[PDB]
Amino acid sequence: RDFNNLTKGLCTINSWHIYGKDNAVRIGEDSDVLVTREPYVSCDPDECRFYALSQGTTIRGKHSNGTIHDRSQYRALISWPLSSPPTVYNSRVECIGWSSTSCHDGKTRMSICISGPNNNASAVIWYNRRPVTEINTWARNILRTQESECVCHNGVCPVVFTDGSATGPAETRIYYFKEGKILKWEPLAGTAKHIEECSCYGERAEITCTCRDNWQGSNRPVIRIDPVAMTHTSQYICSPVLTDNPRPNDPTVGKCNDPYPGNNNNGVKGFSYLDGVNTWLGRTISIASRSGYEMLKVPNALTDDKSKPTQGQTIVLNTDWSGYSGSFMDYWAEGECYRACFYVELIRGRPKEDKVWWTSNSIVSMCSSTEFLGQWDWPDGAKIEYFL
Amino acid sequence: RDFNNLTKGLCTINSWHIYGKDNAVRIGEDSDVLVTREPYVSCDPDECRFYALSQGTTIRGKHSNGTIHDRSQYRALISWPLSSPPTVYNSRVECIGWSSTSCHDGKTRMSICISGPNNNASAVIWYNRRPVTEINTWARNILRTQESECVCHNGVCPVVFTDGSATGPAETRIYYFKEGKILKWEPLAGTAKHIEECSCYGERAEITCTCRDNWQGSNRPVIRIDPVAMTHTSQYICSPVLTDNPRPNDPTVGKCNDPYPGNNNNGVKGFSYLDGVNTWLGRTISIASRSGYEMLKVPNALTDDKSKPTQGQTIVLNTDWSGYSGSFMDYWAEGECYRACFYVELIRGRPKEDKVWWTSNSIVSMCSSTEFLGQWDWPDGAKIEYFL
Amino acid sequence: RDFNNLTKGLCTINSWHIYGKDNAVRIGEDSDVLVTREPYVSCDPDECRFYALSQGTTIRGKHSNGTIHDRSQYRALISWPLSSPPTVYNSRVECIGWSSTSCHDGKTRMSICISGPNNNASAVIWYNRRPVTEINTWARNILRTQESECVCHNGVCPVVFTDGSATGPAETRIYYFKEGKILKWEPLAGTAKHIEECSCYGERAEITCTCRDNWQGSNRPVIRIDPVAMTHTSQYICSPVLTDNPRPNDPTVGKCNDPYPGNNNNGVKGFSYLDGVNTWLGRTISIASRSGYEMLKVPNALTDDKSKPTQGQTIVLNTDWSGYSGSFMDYWAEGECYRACFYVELIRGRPKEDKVWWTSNSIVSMCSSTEFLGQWDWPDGAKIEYFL
Amino acid sequence: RDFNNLTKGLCTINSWHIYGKDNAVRIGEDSDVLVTREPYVSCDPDECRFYALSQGTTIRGKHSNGTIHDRSQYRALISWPLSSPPTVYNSRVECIGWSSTSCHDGKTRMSICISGPNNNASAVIWYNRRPVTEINTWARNILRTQESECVCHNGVCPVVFTDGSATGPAETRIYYFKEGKILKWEPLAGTAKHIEECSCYGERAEITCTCRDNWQGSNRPVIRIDPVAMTHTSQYICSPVLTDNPRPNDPTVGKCNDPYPGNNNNGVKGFSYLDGVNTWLGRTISIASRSGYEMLKVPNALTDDKSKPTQGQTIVLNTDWSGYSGSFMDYWAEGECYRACFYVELIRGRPKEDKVWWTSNSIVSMCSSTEFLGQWDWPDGAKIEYFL
Numbered sequence A, B, C, D: 001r002d003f004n005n006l007t008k009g010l011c012t013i014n015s016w017h018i019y020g021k022d023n024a025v026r027i028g029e030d031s032d033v034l035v036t037r038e039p040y041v042s043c044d045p046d047e048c049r050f051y052a053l054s055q056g057t058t059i060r061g062k063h064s065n066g067t068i069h070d071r072s073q074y075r076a077l078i079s080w081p082l083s084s085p086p087t088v089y090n091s092r093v094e095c096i097g098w099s100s101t102s103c104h105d106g107k108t109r110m111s112i113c114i115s116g117p118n119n120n121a122s123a124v125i126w127y128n129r130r131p132v133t134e135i136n137t138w139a140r141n142i143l144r145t146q147e148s149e150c151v152c153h154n155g156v157c158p159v160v161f162t163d164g165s166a167t168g169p170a171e172t173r174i175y176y177f178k179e180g181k182i183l184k185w186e187p188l189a190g191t192a193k194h195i196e197e198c199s200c201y202g203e204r205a206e207i208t209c210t211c212r213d214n215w216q217g218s219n220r221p222v223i224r225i226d227p228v229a230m231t232h233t234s235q236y237i238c239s240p241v242l243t244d245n246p247r248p249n250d251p252t253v254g255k256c257n258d259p260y261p262g263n264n265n266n267g268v269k270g271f272s273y274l275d276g277v278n279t280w281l282g283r284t285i286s287i288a289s290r291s292g293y294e295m296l297k298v299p300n301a302l303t304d305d306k307s308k309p310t311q312g313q314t315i316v317l318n319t320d321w322s323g324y325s326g327s328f329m330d331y332w333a334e335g336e337c338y339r340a341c342f343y344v345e346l347i348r349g350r351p352k353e354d355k356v357w358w359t360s361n362s363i364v365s366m367c368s369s370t371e372f373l374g375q376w377d378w379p380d381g382a383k384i385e386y387f388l
C-alpha cells in the first residue's frame, strides 16, 4: 500500500543457491505446455512469478512449427506460478505483444508489451491490469524493450527502449513511468554506443542496468539510473572478462568507454551485479554460441580494465544449451539487504537442434547465498529424440 | 459497493491499440479448448473477462461435429480470464442457454441466458450468480438477445430482446432490470424496423446500442436509452458508409429512418461509437461475407447522410475470416473519460472452411488510444490443414 | 457466521427453469473428466456446487473398465464448480468412500462418506473439512446414506442412514449432527417399511425427505423431521401416481401406510416437493427402466390416495437415459420463499449401453419458476459410438 | 497469527479411519499426473495438503523412463490439494531438490529442499515462501533429511539431517529453526547408531521422531526432542515387533540401545506413535520387501523389550505394494487432543514391476478413531498392464 523504495544494499554474494526451475520442455513432452522464449522472473509483495513471451501454441501442437520466429500476432506476455511450467491452464496473460517488461511498484504492477509490424510497432503500458498509456514507434524499426523486469523507486519505474537498427546507431530512450503515465523520457547519453535488452536491479536508490550492444560490443554496456533525479549515465564494463555471445577470447585489458571489438551484429541478453568487490558477471561458457553458463566474481569489473575472476560457479555445463539471462530480486523479502537473483533461459530446438520444427525453452534461477555452497549444474533435461 | 453511474464522456479516439487476443483455435489444436461462438468481453470492478456461448465439447472432440448449429441443449454462457482460451478447466459457467447478455452494475453481475425449442424459449435472469427472474417467449419464435454486454446506470441495466421473425416484422422489447428484477419493459419505438443483437455502451447517463436489422437494413439500426427515465428512441445510422454484412456497395447518400436496401434476410452482429466528430464505425471489409475487419472514423455518421471516412484502421485483412463484433468498456478504469473498446469474433470452420466438421472462433479486442498508433492486422492464426 | 434457520416456505411452483447442466460425458470424450455416479447439488452461503462419487479414473482412461460396480477403494465424494464437468484438475475431494451426503449449516460444511467391505463399513463425518466423528456399521451389511444433500436448522443437520438388507427389513437410523458431533440418533419409526437414499429439503422449521423403498414399494416412503425436537414420522406418498422405478402401471388408488406392490427388490433414488396444492413429483417416464424424466403437479399427493396430475413438465424424453434424482435448494438466496430445485443423473454406459466397458453420468438441474415457462428436454447429449 | 504450541496429548487410538487417498497412478494413466516418490501430508491452520518429490515429468511422458533414480536436477518438492493427484496444473512447487521436509509454525510455513551432486549438496531453508538460510554439506556424502513433515513449538521447528555413509557411521545433526534462521544445531547423541528419514509428531511440548537405521537396525531408532531446551535423546524401540524392512523374523526379545541385527545396509522410511499403552507401530507385512502394510497396537513398545501386539489393523494386503510411511497431525483441529495420522506411499513400477520403465506412487492416509472401526484394505488400484 506504499510505493517501495530501494533503501537496502546488495547482500554479500559468496555463492548461488537454486531458487526455481520449471523443467517445462521435459514436462511439455506430454502435457499442455505453451511454447515460449524471452523469459524472466519478477516479484510482487506477496508472490514471485515466472514470465515469458508465449508463441500462442503448445510444444506438442502442430502450430509449434515456425516458432523460431521472434515476432508474430500470436505472442503474449504471460506469467505463471514459480517453478511451474507455463501451461495453457495456469498461464495469466499480462498483455499482447512480442517484446515486454514488467515490475511491481509496491502498490501494483506495470506491464509493457510492444506489438506491430517492424515499421509500425507500438508499446502499451498497463498498470493495475488496465491499459493506461501508449507509445508509437519513433524510428520505425522494431520498437523493443528489456525482456526482463523493470525496477521501481517511490512510484517511479524507469524502462529502457530501443528503436532503429540492430547493426548500427539506433535510438534508445529511458522512459520514467509512474502509475503507467509518462513522467519524463530522455535519449540515451554517456559512452554506450548501442543498447538492447537491459537487465536491471535496484539498490540504495540507484538502478543499474546491464545491456546488450548488438552492433559492436562483446563487453556489455551499462546504464545507471537515478530514479529521483530521473537522470542516467552509460559506459561499458571495463573488465577483460567479456560477457556477451558470440565474442572473441578474453584479452588482458577491456574497454571502459567503447565496444570491445571482434564480433559484430549479434549478441545475447545477459546481466551482472556491479558492487565493488561484491561484483559477479554471468556469461555463456562458449564464445561461439548460447552454450553453457557460469557466474564469475570479478572485483571492480565495472571500473577496472584489467580485472580478472577471483571466484566462480558453473550453472550450466558447456555440453548443455543456455540462452538469455537477466536480473531480478525480491524487494519485499525480510532482512537488511537485497539478495541478488538471476534466471537463465535454457533454449531447446531451433536453430541448434533442428530435428524438431520448434524453438522453446525452460527456466532455471538462482539467488545469492552468504555461504560458500557446493555447485551443481542445471540443464534443461529434455531428450529431443522423444519429440521426433 | 455503490452502483456505477455513467458520469464520464468517451475518450477521444485517435487510433486503436491491442487489448486482448486468445488464439483459441491455434491453441485448441492440441489442448482442451471448448468450441464456442457469439463471444464478447465484459468488466467487473476488479477484473475484465472473455465471454462466449460454449457448444459443450472441445474442438478436437468428436462432438465438435455439427457445431455449425446455433441452438442446442449443450450450449452455455461461459466466462474465462482475459486473453486465455476458453478451456474445460478455466471456464466458469454463468448460465445455461444459446443466447445471452451479461453486465456488472458496480455491486454485482447480472447474466441472462435464453434456452428452449424455437416455439417455447425462456430467458432466466441471474443476479449475484443466483436465478432471480424468468421471462417466457411472447411471440413463440426464437426469443433472443444481445450476444454482448449490457450496460448499467445506478442499478438499472437495460436489455434488448427480440421474439418473432428474422425475415419480417418482429416483437422487440426493452427490459429495464435492477438487481435481476423487472422494473419496466417497453415495446420498441422509433423508426428502426427490425432489431437483433444490440451492441451497447454507456456515457454521460445515456446508453447507445448499435444493432442488426436482419430483415432489410444494410445500414445499422440504433437504439438510444435513457436509463433514468427508462425510455428510448430508435433510428438508423444516416451514413452511406454501410456496416452490416452482406451489404451492397457504399452509396453517396444513407438513410436515417429506414433500412438501406439491397440485401434481405441476413446480417451480422456489429457495433459503433457515435460521438459527434469522435464517431467510429466497424465493418467487415467484404460486402459478401464475414471476411476482414476495419474501423472507420466517420464524423457525425449517426446524423449526416452524406458522411464519409476521414480516418481508419485495418483490424483483420480481407484475406482472413472475421465474424461478430461488439462493444464494451472498462467503466471502473482511472481517468476522466471512458475508453471505447470492441472485440471481433474470428470464425473458423463451417460454413466457409468445410474441410472440418466444426465451427468455432477465437477473439481479438482493441481499445482506443489518444495517440495515432501504427496498425497491424490480427488474424485467428490457425491452419485448418492441421485439423484434418 | 450464524447457523441458517428454515424460516421460509416454498415458493409457488408454476414451472421449472434450467439451473445447471455439465455435459460431462460429451466433454469427457476428449478431456480429463472423472467417471462418476450418484451426483447431486448443494449450496454454501456464497456458492452452489455439483457433487458426485468419483470412480478414481477418467472416462477415456483404461481404468474406466469395470465402473458399473458401486463400491471400491477408488471412489470419493468430489465437488466442483456449478455446470462445470468433474475434471481431474477442478474436482475437490470432500472425503473418501462409496456412499455420501453433504450440507452447509450456515457457518461451515458437514460431509459424510462411508467406506469399507460390505460386512465392515464405517461412516466418517467431516466438519469444516476435518474429520470429527466416526460411526461403525451396526447391521454388517453395506452401511449407506442419502446420495444427496442433508439439511440443517440452527446447527442441527439430520441424516438418514440404513444398514442391513436391500430385500427385506433393514435398520434405518436418523442421526442428528451439530458441528460434526452426534447430538442424538433414533431408529426409524412410522409406517415406512424400507428406507434408502433419502432426498431432503427444508421449509418452515421442518425437513421433508422422499426416499426409496427398495424391498417392496413403488410408491415412495416419506420421512418428516423436526430438527428442534429431534423427532420424526414416516409414511408413504398416498398418491396413485407412482414414482419409483421399476414400477407397475399407475392405479386409481395409492397406499398411505404400506408399500404399493407389484415390483420387489429394486428401485431408484428420487424426490418430491410436498406442499399441499403446491406439490410436485418427479419420476422416470418408463415403468421398466431409468429412461426419461418428468415433473408432475399432484395436489395433496402425500395425503390424497386418489390424487392425479393437474400439470406437468417433461425434463428428459423417454428416448433418453435418466437415473437418480434428488432435491436441494439455495437456502441463502434473496427473497421471501425457498425456490425448489432438483437434479437428474443422466446415466450413460453399462448396463443399458454395453458397447462401452464403463458406467458414468452427467448432470442436469432445474429450479422452480412462478411463471408458466415453455418446456425443453435435456438429454445427456453424448454419442456412445464416439467412445468405441 | 500466534506460533502454535504443542499443548495437547494424543487422542486414544482404538482404530484407524480413512483420511485421504489420491489414486494417482490409476488416474495418471490418462491425465497429466506428475511422477513422484517420497510423499507425505502436512497441515496449515486452514488446509491440509499432500506433498511429494516430483521427478519433473508426467507418468505417461517419455521422460518417466529412468525415474527409479532418486537424485536428479529435475526433482522438486510439490504440494497439492488433499486427495487430489499431483498434476502438472494443480501442483505448487515449494522448492527445488531431491530431499525435503516442511512444516507450518502457526504463522507461516518452512520448507527445506536439498540439491546438488553427492559430494557437494546443500540445503535451502524457505520460510513464508522465500529463501532465508542455506547449509552446505558437512560430510560430502548425500546431505539428506526427513522426507516427511517437521514439527514446530512456539516458533521453534527442529529438523533431523544426516550426511555421510548409508552403510556405516554417519554425521546426523538436529537443527533448531525459527523463522527459517538457525537458532542452534547439535550432533546426534544417545544410543541410536545410524539415523535417516525421521518421521515426527508433537504432543505436550515434546517432539518424537521414529527413524530408519539403514546400516544395522531392523528395530527403529527414536529421537525425542525438547523444542524449548533445544536438546534431544535417542534410543531404539525396545519391542521385538520389528518394523523396518527388509528385516529378520520377529524374536521374543528386542533391543533398547542397539540395532536389532540380521539385515544390513537397507531399510525403509517408517513411523510409530509412542504413548504408553496408546502405542501403535506401522510396518510392511513382508519381511523381504515393501509389500503390505499394517498397524499394530504394542503397549509400551518404546520401553518394553518383550512387548507384543494386543490389537491391529491391516492397511494394505501383502498382495499389494507399499513403500515409505510417515507421521503428521492436524495441530489446528478442534477438541482436546491431537489425532494421530499417517500416510503410506504405494510404490508402483520399478524395481518390483519392471515391465514399465518408470517408478512412481500414489498415497493413502488414515487418522485415529476412538471407535473400534471395521477395516478395509487400500491398494494403489492401478493395472500395470494398461501402461504397456
Ligand SMILES: *[C@@H]1O[C@H](CO)[C@@H](O[C@@H]2O[C@H](CO)[C@@H](O[C@@H]3O[C@H](CO[C@H]4O[C@H](CO[C@H]5O[C@H](CO)[C@@H](O)[C@H](O)[C@@H]5O)[C@@H](O)[C@H](O[C@H]5O[C@H](CO)[C@@H](O)[C@H](O)[C@@H]5O)[C@@H]4O)[C@@H](O)[C@H](O[C@H]4O[C@H](CO)[C@@H](O)[C@H](O)[C@@H]4O[C@H]4O[C@H](CO)[C@@H](O)[C@H](O)[C@@H]4O[C@H]4O[C@H](CO)[C@@H](O)[C@H](O)[C@@H]4O)[C@@H]3O)[C@H](O)[C@H]2NC(C)=O)[C@H](O)[C@H]1NC(C)=O
Binding pocket: A240, A241, A242, A248, A249, A250, A251, A285, A286, A287, A294, A295, A296, A308, A309, A310, A311, A312, A313, A372, A373, A374, A375, D119, D120
Ligand atoms: C564443491 O563445490 C565448490 C563450490 O562451487 C567447488 O569449489 C569451486 O570450484 C570452482 C571450479 O574450480 C571454482 O571456480 C573457478 O574459480 C576461479 C577463480 O579462483 C582461482 O583463482 C583465484 C584468483 O587468483 C590471481 O589472484 C589471486 C589473489 O586474489 C592470487 O593469489 C593468484 O595466484 C592469482 O594470480 C584464486 O584466489 C583461487 O584460489 C581459493 O580457492 C581455490 C579453490 O578454487 C583454492 O584451491 C585456493 O587455495 C584458494 O584458497 C583459485 O586459484 C576462476 O578463475 C575459474 O573461472 C576460469 O576457468 C573456468 C574453467 O574452469 C572458465 O570456464 C572460466 O571462464 C574462468 O576462465 C576463463 O576466463 C579467464 C578470465 O579471462 C581466463 O584467464 C582463463 O584462461 C579462461 O579463459 C578461456 O575460457 C573462457 C570461458 O570459456 C573464454 O571466454 C576465454 O576466451 C578462454 O577460451 C572458475 O570460476 C570456485 O571458485 C570454487 N568455489 C569455492 C568456494 O571454492 C568445489 O570444486 C566442489 N568440490 C568438488 C569436489 O567438486
Ligand SMILES: *[C@@H]1O[C@H](CO)[C@@H](O[C@@H]2O[C@H](CO)[C@@H](O[C@@H]3O[C@H](CO[C@H]4O[C@H](CO[C@H]5O[C@H](CO)[C@@H](O)[C@H](O)[C@@H]5O)[C@@H](O)[C@H](O[C@H]5O[C@H](CO)[C@@H](O)[C@H](O)[C@@H]5O)[C@@H]4O)[C@@H](O)[C@H](O[C@H]4O[C@H](CO)[C@@H](O)[C@H](O)[C@@H]4O[C@H]4O[C@H](CO)[C@@H](O)[C@H](O)[C@@H]4O[C@H]4O[C@H](CO)[C@@H](O)[C@H](O)[C@@H]4O)[C@@H]3O)[C@H](O)[C@H]2NC(C)=O)[C@H](O)[C@H]1NC(C)=O
Binding pocket: A119, A120, B240, B241, B242, B248, B249, B250, B251, B285, B286, B287, B294, B295, B296, B308, B309, B310, B311, B312, B313, B372, B373, B374, B375
Ligand atoms: C503506419 O500506421 C499508420 C496508422 O494506422 C498508417 O497510417 C494510416 O493508413 C491507413 C491506410 O491508408 C489510413 O486508413 C484510410 O483512411 C482513409 C481516410 O483518410 C484519406 O481521406 C481523408 C478524408 O479526405 C475528404 O475530406 C478531406 C477533409 O476532411 C479532404 O481534405 C479530402 O481531399 C477528401 O475530399 C483525408 O483527410 C486523409 O488525409 C491525412 O492522412 C493521410 C494518411 O492517410 C495523409 O497522407 C494526408 O496528407 C492527411 O494529412 C486521406 O487522404 C479512408 O478513406 C480509408 O478507408 C477506405 O479505403 C479502404 C482501402 O484502403 C477501404 O477498406 C475502406 O472501407 C475505405 O474505403 C471504402 O469506403 C469509402 C466510403 O464509402 C468509399 O469511398 C471507397 O471507395 C471504398 O469503397 C469500396 O470498399 C468498401 C470496403 O470494402 C466497400 O464496402 C464499398 O462498397 C466499395 O467496394 C482508410 O481507412 C489511416 O487513416 C492512416 N492513419 C493515420 C493516423 O495516418 C500508415 O500507413 C502505416 N505506415 C506504413 C508505412 O505502413
Ligand SMILES: *[C@@H]1O[C@H](CO)[C@@H](O[C@@H]2O[C@H](CO)[C@@H](O[C@@H]3O[C@H](CO[C@H]4O[C@H](CO[C@H]5O[C@H](CO)[C@@H](O)[C@H](O)[C@@H]5O)[C@@H](O)[C@H](O[C@H]5O[C@H](CO)[C@@H](O)[C@H](O)[C@@H]5O)[C@@H]4O)[C@@H](O)[C@H](O[C@H]4O[C@H](CO)[C@@H](O)[C@H](O)[C@@H]4O[C@H]4O[C@H](CO)[C@@H](O)[C@H](O)[C@@H]4O[C@H]4O[C@H](CO)[C@@H](O)[C@H](O)[C@@H]4O)[C@@H]3O)[C@H](O)[C@H]2NC(C)=O)[C@H](O)[C@H]1NC(C)=O
Binding pocket: B119, B120, C240, C241, C242, C248, C249, C250, C251, C285, C286, C287, C294, C295, C296, C308, C309, C310, C311, C312, C313, C372, C373, C374, C375
Ligand atoms: C409450450 O410449453 C408449455 C409448458 O410446458 C407446454 O404446455 C404443457 O404441455 C404439457 C404436455 O401437454 C403439459 O403436461 C401434461 O399435463 C397433464 C395435466 O394437465 C391436463 O389435465 C388437467 C387435469 O385435469 C382432471 O381435473 C381437472 C380439474 O382440476 C378437470 O378439469 C379435467 O377435466 C380432468 O378430469 C387439466 O386441468 C389440464 O387442462 C389446462 O391446461 C391445458 C394444457 O395442458 C389446457 O389445454 C386446458 O384447457 C387447461 O386450461 C389438462 O387437460 C398431465 O396429466 C400430463 O401428464 C400425463 O401424460 C404424460 C404423457 O403426455 C405422461 O408422461 C404423464 O405421466 C401423465 O400421464 C400418466 O399418468 C397419469 C396419472 O396416473 C395417467 O392417468 C395417464 O394415463 C398416464 O399413465 C401411463 O403413463 C405413465 C408414465 O409413463 C405410466 O407410469 C402409467 O403406468 C401409464 O403407462 C402432462 O404432464 C403441461 O401441464 C402444460 N403446461 C402448461 C403451463 O400449460 C406447451 O405444450 C408447449 N407448447 C408447444 C407448442 O409445444
Ligand SMILES: *[C@@H]1O[C@H](CO)[C@@H](O[C@@H]2O[C@H](CO)[C@@H](O[C@@H]3O[C@H](CO[C@H]4O[C@H](CO[C@H]5O[C@H](CO)[C@@H](O)[C@H](O)[C@@H]5O)[C@@H](O)[C@H](O[C@H]5O[C@H](CO)[C@@H](O)[C@H](O)[C@@H]5O)[C@@H]4O)[C@@H](O)[C@H](O[C@H]4O[C@H](CO)[C@@H](O)[C@H](O)[C@@H]4O[C@H]4O[C@H](CO)[C@@H](O)[C@H](O)[C@@H]4O[C@H]4O[C@H](CO)[C@@H](O)[C@H](O)[C@@H]4O)[C@@H]3O)[C@H](O)[C@H]2NC(C)=O)[C@H](O)[C@H]1NC(C)=O
Binding pocket: C119, C120, D240, D241, D242, D248, D249, D250, D251, D285, D286, D287, D294, D295, D296, D308, D309, D310, D311, D312, D313, D372, D373, D374, D375
Ligand atoms: C471387522 O473389522 C474389525 C476391526 O479391524 C476386525 O476385527 C480385528 O481383526 C483383526 C484380524 O484378526 C485384528 O488384528 C490382529 O490382532 C492381534 C492382536 O489381538 C489377539 O491377541 C490379543 C493379545 O493377546 C496375549 O495377551 C492377552 C492379554 O493382553 C491374552 O489374553 C492372550 O491370551 C495372549 O497371550 C488378544 O487380546 C486378542 O483378543 C480381543 O480381540 C479378539 C479379536 O481379534 C477377540 O476374538 C478376543 O476374544 C478378544 O476380546 C486376540 O486374540 C494381532 O496379534 C494380529 O497381528 C498378528 O497376525 C497378523 C496376521 O493376522 C500379522 O500380520 C501381524 O504382524 C501379527 O503377527 C506377527 O507378529 C507377532 C508379533 O511378533 C508374532 O507373534 C506372530 O507370529 C506374527 O509373526 C509373522 O508375521 C510377521 C508379519 O508378517 C513377521 O514380521 C514375523 O517375522 C512372522 O513371520 C492382528 O493385528 C484386530 O485387532 C481386530 N480388531 C478388533 C477391534 O477386534 C474383524 O475381524 C472384521 N470382521 C470381519 C467379519 O472381517
Ligand SMILES: CC(=O)N[C@H]1[C@H]([C@H](O)[C@H](O)CO)O[C@@](O)(C(=O)O)C[C@@H]1O
Binding pocket: B038, B070, B071, B098, B099, B142, B143, B144, B165, B166, B196, B197, B214, B267, B268
Ligand atoms: C438465437 C439465434 O439463433 N441466433 C443466431 C442468429 C440468428 O440466426 C439471426 O440473428 C437471425 O434471427 O445469427 C447467427 O445465425 C449468425 O448469423 O451467425 C448466430 C446466432 O446464433
Ligand SMILES: CC(=O)N[C@H]1[C@H]([C@H](O)[C@H](O)CO)O[C@@](O)(C(=O)O)C[C@@H]1O
Binding pocket: C038, C070, C071, C098, C099, C142, C143, C144, C165, C166, C196, C197, C214, C267, C268
Ligand atoms: C451403497 C450402495 O451400494 N448403493 C447403491 C444402491 C444400492 O445397491 C441399493 O440402494 C440397494 O440397497 O443402488 C445402486 O446400485 C443403483 O441402484 O444404481 C447404486 C448405489 O451405488
Ligand SMILES: CC(=O)N[C@H]1[C@H]([C@H](O)[C@H](O)CO)O[C@@](O)(C(=O)O)C[C@@H]1O
Binding pocket: D038, D070, D071, D098, D099, D142, D143, D144, D165, D166, D196, D197, D214, D267, D268
Ligand atoms: C537422498 C536419497 O537419495 N534418499 C533415498 C534413500 C537413501 O538411498 C537411503 O536412505 C540410504 O541412505 O532411500 C531410497 O533410496 C529408498 O530406499 O527408496 C529413496 C530416497 O530417495
Ligand SMILES: [Ca+2]
Binding pocket: A212, A213, A214, A215, A216, A217, A218, A244, A245, A263, A265, A266, A267, A268
Ligand atoms: Ca554483441
Ligand SMILES: [Ca+2]
Binding pocket: B212, B213, B214, B215, B216, B217, B218, B244, B245, B263, B265, B266, B267, B268
Ligand atoms: Ca442486414
Ligand SMILES: [Ca+2]
Binding pocket: C212, C213, C214, C215, C216, C217, C218, C244, C245, C263, C265, C266, C267, C268
Ligand atoms: Ca422400489
Ligand SMILES: [Ca+2]
Binding pocket: D212, D213, D214, D215, D216, D217, D218, D244, D245, D263, D265, D266, D267, D268
Ligand atoms: Ca534397516
